[PDB]
Design a protein around this nucleic acid. Structure first.
Ligand SMILES: [Mg+2]
Ligand SMILES: [Mg+2]
Ligand SMILES: [Mg+2]
Ligand SMILES: [Mg+2]
Ligand SMILES: [Mg+2]
Ligand SMILES: [Mg+2]
Ligand SMILES: [Mg+2]
Ligand SMILES: [Mg+2]
Ligand SMILES: [Mg+2]
Ligand SMILES: [Mg+2]
Ligand SMILES: [Mg+2]
Ligand SMILES: [Mg+2]
Ligand SMILES: [Mg+2]
Ligand SMILES: [Mg+2]
Ligand SMILES: [Mg+2]
Ligand SMILES: [Mg+2]
Ligand SMILES: [Mg+2]
Ligand SMILES: [Mg+2]
Ligand SMILES: [Mg+2]
Ligand SMILES: [Mg+2]
Ligand SMILES: [Mg+2]
Ligand SMILES: [Mg+2]
Ligand SMILES: [Mg+2]
Ligand SMILES: [Mg+2]
Ligand SMILES: [Mg+2]
Ligand SMILES: [Mg+2]
Ligand SMILES: [Mg+2]
Ligand SMILES: [Mg+2]
Ligand SMILES: [Mg+2]
Ligand SMILES: [Mg+2]
Ligand SMILES: [Mg+2]
Ligand SMILES: [Mg+2]
Ligand SMILES: [Mg+2]
Ligand SMILES: [Mg+2]
Ligand SMILES: [Mg+2]
Ligand SMILES: [Mg+2]
Ligand SMILES: [Mg+2]
Ligand SMILES: [Mg+2]
Ligand SMILES: [Mg+2]
Ligand SMILES: [Mg+2]
Ligand SMILES: [Mg+2]
Ligand SMILES: [Mg+2]
Ligand SMILES: [Mg+2]
Ligand SMILES: [Mg+2]
Ligand SMILES: [Mg+2]
Ligand SMILES: [Mg+2]
Ligand SMILES: [Mg+2]
Ligand SMILES: [Mg+2]
Ligand SMILES: [Mg+2]
Ligand SMILES: [Mg+2]
Ligand SMILES: [Mg+2]
Ligand SMILES: [Mg+2]
Ligand SMILES: [Mg+2]
Ligand SMILES: [Mg+2]
Ligand SMILES: [Mg+2]
Ligand SMILES: [Mg+2]
Ligand SMILES: [Mg+2]
Ligand SMILES: [Mg+2]
Ligand SMILES: [Mg+2]
Ligand SMILES: [Mg+2]
Ligand SMILES: [Mg+2]
Ligand SMILES: [Mg+2]
Ligand SMILES: [Mg+2]
Ligand SMILES: [Mg+2]
Ligand SMILES: [Mg+2]
Ligand SMILES: [Mg+2]
Ligand SMILES: [Mg+2]
Ligand SMILES: [Mg+2]
Ligand SMILES: [Mg+2]
Ligand SMILES: [Mg+2]
Ligand SMILES: [Mg+2]
Ligand SMILES: [Mg+2]
Ligand SMILES: [Mg+2]
Ligand SMILES: [Mg+2]
Ligand SMILES: [Mg+2]
Ligand SMILES: [Mg+2]
Ligand SMILES: [Mg+2]
Ligand SMILES: [Mg+2]
Ligand SMILES: [Mg+2]
Ligand SMILES: [Mg+2]
Ligand SMILES: [Mg+2]
Ligand SMILES: [Mg+2]
Ligand SMILES: [Mg+2]
Ligand SMILES: [Mg+2]
Ligand SMILES: [Mg+2]
Ligand SMILES: [Mg+2]
Ligand SMILES: [Mg+2]
Ligand SMILES: [Mg+2]
Ligand SMILES: [Mg+2]
Ligand SMILES: [Mg+2]
Ligand SMILES: [Mg+2]
Ligand SMILES: [Mg+2]
Ligand SMILES: [Mg+2]
Ligand SMILES: [Mg+2]
Ligand SMILES: [Mg+2]
Lengths: 114, 70, 88, 101, 271
RNA sequence: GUGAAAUGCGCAGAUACCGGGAGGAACGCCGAUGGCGAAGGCAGCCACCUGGUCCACCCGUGACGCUGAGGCGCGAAAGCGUGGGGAGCAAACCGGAUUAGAUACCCGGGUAGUCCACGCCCUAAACGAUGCGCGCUAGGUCUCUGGGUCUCCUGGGGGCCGAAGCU
């Protein structure tokens, strides 16, 4: 919420954008970022380079709150998933452990027209 | 690699409680492991699947393990 | 399914001789029994159509056996119908 | 009469006295529906996968009994009525299947 | 479900009556101090305060036991199910073993010979009444006290029923027949199950005459009056609402909530 | 959100994350070249009720068989009646985009419906586009399921390759 060294980062990989939410080890967010926050609009928010800058920026912001250690959690498939991850550990942030939690139904709700 | 059938000793596969036995079949993520790698035959593969499902319902077995470190 | 003993009760009864596990009369009664269990089952499971087909086939089979026993010996037939309170 | 293995999962975090009270209930119920008991394995507390009832653990009781099949349903209903009964699963017993002999 | 008629007369062609199949052969209500009287088309001044009423068909009033906590533990055998012209529901005359007798809204699924009882101890099943705190969440129920020891008054209409939604403090959330959600108190008794005669919503009165037997007088559209009698009273050739649709007294009648804002009762409801 | 966008949503605090709760629908992995059914069709798990079918033993009846106009029953989806249910999806409908136009393909919204009960409707690329029953005419391989001391033998299904032959 305000001051903790350990924590966790959340990758969210859409196909038209990528966001990242760093939170305390409880769940409550500290800060976040995304392709749009970075500067891009539309398709480019999907770009892997944007995703790179998102994780980077989200990291820098967390760095200030005293963040140093984070377990990464990813959901999505967008071209930027691993790039957010790669950009995370390379951000001097401690990547304790990357995890995949991308939801998927055991057959329930009918999808869109696609 | 290593067939799951031979990997274990003699065992009953209608037993929906010897989690230690069953747990070995249940993939890295709780997915009922493919027959083409459990070494099981048609009839046995079926009875297994049914008992696993039973266990999961009793809470003994998982429905989904998260993919760790990737 | 009907109790195995209850099946005997029928066979032992209708068999026109000991070990007659396959007479005409025997098959007939043996059907009539299974038919009426369906009659009631469907009497409550009205949605259960697939089983109803089965019943039609049974009722049908029971027909031939009588059609035959009727033609074969109208004496044994008269008694078997009258006994099973059958044909309405 | 038919053989059944009757599984029950109970609230883990509760005293042995009320836990005895919950068994007070199950024992009755069975008899109330003509359940001639057989060997029983009160495995007790256990660590189970998905946290049911918000709990990562639960007390297990595996009975076994011959009884009138036409009433196994009503019994299961009666069994589940309990709140501290987190789960019931009566099953038809079957001849075990030797695998990888 | 419902008895219908061959169209040997018009109106008879649509008219349908309820099959009183359930009503266990018992025309005469339990005279035993059970019926009273009624009548009265208007208020205590001579004035009419409810339009278009009066005509009915002379009914003794069946005395119903809406509290029922007055006989805790005492069980009773349902002697019969009777017709009650005073309600949408059917009543059930039950003989308490105590020797005493009483009426009760016959819940759907109740049948004669059945035993039944009230109290906290009572087994959860149709007919049995007991404090909500003891009713297993999720169970449907009817004849619900709004406040403890004040008498049942929720879900008494035919086929209506409330369902428990969960506990919370001394109160217990439940969905009313209206779909409304609200906390009712714990010590509020309530008899298990839904109310009887559910196919009641299907009867086709069939003719104006029948409405009269129910005591309903012909109701006259304000559009068909004069400016003096009603807002809509423009009358001047099957004309449209002068706007916007109003009551005979002039309050808008399409939308426009009437329930008081600051009612302290508000605190206990949820949508 | 897309080809890119726009409509839309969001400082009245949305998206992303966590906790508690409500409700409907559909059943991941097992799952397939698989299985069952007369067809339409049938997939989480449990119990009950029930149909068809296959193998063994050589036990029983003794041709009781086949087909079957009309009759009767079943009959995907959509659709209809009464009442209930309504999360997702979504004809119609509204808006955005594209275009010469776009009453469409794409996008943002969205109703009947899709779900349940009872009752109608009775159609289809209801397709193997191949009526049912029986007997007879090389084999090779693959698989599902029964019986038997069992690198195999013998029934019952599901595919492929192919004698003769047919076309
Ligand atoms: Mg762009
Ligand atoms: Mg894009
Ligand atoms: Mg759409
Ligand atoms: Mg797999
Ligand atoms: Mg039966
Ligand atoms: Mg159904
Ligand atoms: Mg002859
Ligand atoms: Mg007659
Ligand atoms: Mg008759
Ligand atoms: Mg539950
Ligand atoms: Mg009479
Ligand atoms: Mg009377
Ligand atoms: Mg008195
Ligand atoms: Mg008097
Ligand atoms: Mg009075
Ligand atoms: Mg009045
Ligand atoms: Mg007066
Ligand atoms: Mg007076
Ligand atoms: Mg009150
Ligand atoms: Mg009433
Ligand atoms: Mg108080
Ligand atoms: Mg109506
Ligand atoms: Mg009436
Ligand atoms: Mg009117
Ligand atoms: Mg009028
Ligand atoms: Mg006046
Ligand atoms: Mg006047
Ligand atoms: Mg006017
Ligand atoms: Mg006038
Ligand atoms: Mg006007
Ligand atoms: Mg209006
Ligand atoms: Mg007012
Ligand atoms: Mg008010
Ligand atoms: Mg533009
Ligand atoms: Mg929108
Ligand atoms: Mg502001
Ligand atoms: Mg949650
Ligand atoms: Mg939540
Ligand atoms: Mg809550
Ligand atoms: Mg809802
Ligand atoms: Mg739910
Ligand atoms: Mg539901
Ligand atoms: Mg379904
Ligand atoms: Mg598959
Ligand atoms: Mg494969
Ligand atoms: Mg298939
Ligand atoms: Mg089917
Ligand atoms: Mg079905
Ligand atoms: Mg049944
Ligand atoms: Mg079967
Ligand atoms: Mg069979
Ligand atoms: Mg021989
Ligand atoms: Mg022979
Ligand atoms: Mg023999
Ligand atoms: Mg002979
Ligand atoms: Mg012979
Ligand atoms: Mg023939
Ligand atoms: Mg013929
Ligand atoms: Mg013809
Ligand atoms: Mg025909
Ligand atoms: Mg019909
Ligand atoms: Mg269907
Ligand atoms: Mg339909
Ligand atoms: Mg439709
Ligand atoms: Mg109409
Ligand atoms: Mg409807
Ligand atoms: Mg519902
Ligand atoms: Mg509705
Ligand atoms: Mg809906
Ligand atoms: Mg939509
Ligand atoms: Mg519109
Ligand atoms: Mg606009
Ligand atoms: Mg349009
Ligand atoms: Mg063009
Ligand atoms: Mg134009
Ligand atoms: Mg249009
Ligand atoms: Mg809609
Ligand atoms: Mg229409
Ligand atoms: Mg369904
Ligand atoms: Mg339903
Ligand atoms: Mg329903
Ligand atoms: Mg009709
Ligand atoms: Mg149809
Ligand atoms: Mg045709
Ligand atoms: Mg086809
Ligand atoms: Mg053919
Ligand atoms: Mg053929
Ligand atoms: Mg050969
Ligand atoms: Mg080969
Ligand atoms: Mg074999
Ligand atoms: Mg041999
Ligand atoms: Mg077949
Ligand atoms: Mg197949
Ligand atoms: Mg072959
Ligand atoms: Mg050739």
């Amino acid at each position: 919420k305000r001051q903790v060294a350990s924590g966790r980062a959340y990758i969210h990989a859409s196909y038209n954008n990528t966001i990242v939410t760093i939170t305390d080890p409880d769940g409550n967010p500290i800060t976040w970022s995304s392709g749009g926050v970075i500067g891009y609009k539309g398709s480019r928010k999907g770009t892997p380079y944007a995703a790179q800058l998102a994780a980077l920026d989200a990291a820098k912001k967390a760095m200030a709150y005293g963040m140093q250690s984070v377990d990464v959690i990813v959901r999505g498939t967008g071209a930027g998933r691993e790039q957010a991850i790669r950009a995370l550990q390379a951000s001097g942030l401690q990547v304790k452990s990357i995890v995949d939690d991308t939801p998927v139904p055991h057959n329930g709700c009918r999808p869109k027209k696609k | 690699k290593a067939k799951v059938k031979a990997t274990l000793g003699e065992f009953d596969l209608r037993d929906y409680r010897n989690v230690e036995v069953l747990k070995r079949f249940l993939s890295e993520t709780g997915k009922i492991l493919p027959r083409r790698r459990t070494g099981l035959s048609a009839k046995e593969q079926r009875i297994l699947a049914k008992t696993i499902k039973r266990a999961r319902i009793l809470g003994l077995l998982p429905f989904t393990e998260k993919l760790v470190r990737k | 399914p009907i109790t195995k003993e209850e099946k005997q009760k029928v066979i032992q009864e209708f068999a026109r001789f000991p070990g007659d596990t396959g007479s005409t009369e025997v098959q007939v009664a043996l059907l009539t029994l299974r038919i009426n269990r369906l009659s009631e089952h469907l009497k409550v499971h009205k949605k259960d159509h697939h089983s109803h087909r089965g019943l039609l086939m049974m009722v049908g089979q029971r027909r031939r056996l009588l059609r035959y026993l009727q033609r074969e010996d109208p004496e044994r037939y008269r008694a078997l119908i009258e006994k099973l309170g059958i044909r309405g | 009469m038919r053989r059944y293995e009757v599984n029950i999962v109970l609230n883990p975090n509760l005293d042995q006295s009320q836990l005895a009270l919950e068994k007070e209930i199950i024992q009755r119920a069975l008899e109330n529906y003509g359940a001639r008991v057989e060997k029983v394995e009160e495995l007790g507390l256990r660590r189970l996968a998905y946290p049911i009832a918000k709990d990562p653990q639960g007390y297990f009781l595996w009975y076994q009994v011959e009884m009138p099949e036409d009433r196994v349903n009503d019994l299961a209903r009666e069994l589940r009525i309990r709140d501290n009964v987190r789960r019931v699963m009566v099953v038809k017993s079957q001849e075990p299947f030797l695998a990888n002999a | 479900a419902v008895k219908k008629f061959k169209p040997y007369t018009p109106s008879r062609r649509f008219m349908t009556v309820a099959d009183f199949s359930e009503i266990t052969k018992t025309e005469p209500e339990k005279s035993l101090v059970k019926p009273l009287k009624k009548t009265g088309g208007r208020n205590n001044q001579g004035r009419i305060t409810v339009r278009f009423r009066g005509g009915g068909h002379k009914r003794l009033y069946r005395i119903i036991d809406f509290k029922r906590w007055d006989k805790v533990g005492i069980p009773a055998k349902v002697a019969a199910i009777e017709y009650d012209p005073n309600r949408s529901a059917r009543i059930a005359l039950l003989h308490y073993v105590d020797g005493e007798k009483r009426y009760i809204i016959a819940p759907d699924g109740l049948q004669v010979g059945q035993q039944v009882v009230a109290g906290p101890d009572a087994p959860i099943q149709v007919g049995n009444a007991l404090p909500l705190r003891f009713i297993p969440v999720g169970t449907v129920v009817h004849a619900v006290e709004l406040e403890p020891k004040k008498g049942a008054k929720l879900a008494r209409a035919a086929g209506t029923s409330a369902q428990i939604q969960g506990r919370e403090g001394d109160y217990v959330i439940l969905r009313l027949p209206s779909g409304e959600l609200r906390k009712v108190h714990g010590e509020c008794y309530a008899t298990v199950g839904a109310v009887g005669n559910a196919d009641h919503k299907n009867i086709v009165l069939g003719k104006a005459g029948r409405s009269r037997w129910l005591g309903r007088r012909p109701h006259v559209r304000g559009a068909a009056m004069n400016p003096v009698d009603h807002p809509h009273g423009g009358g001047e050739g099957r004309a449209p609402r002068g706007r916007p649709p109003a009551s005979p007294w002039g309050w808008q009648t399409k939308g426009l909530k009437t329930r008081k804002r600051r009612k302290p009762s508000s605190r206990f409801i949820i949508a």
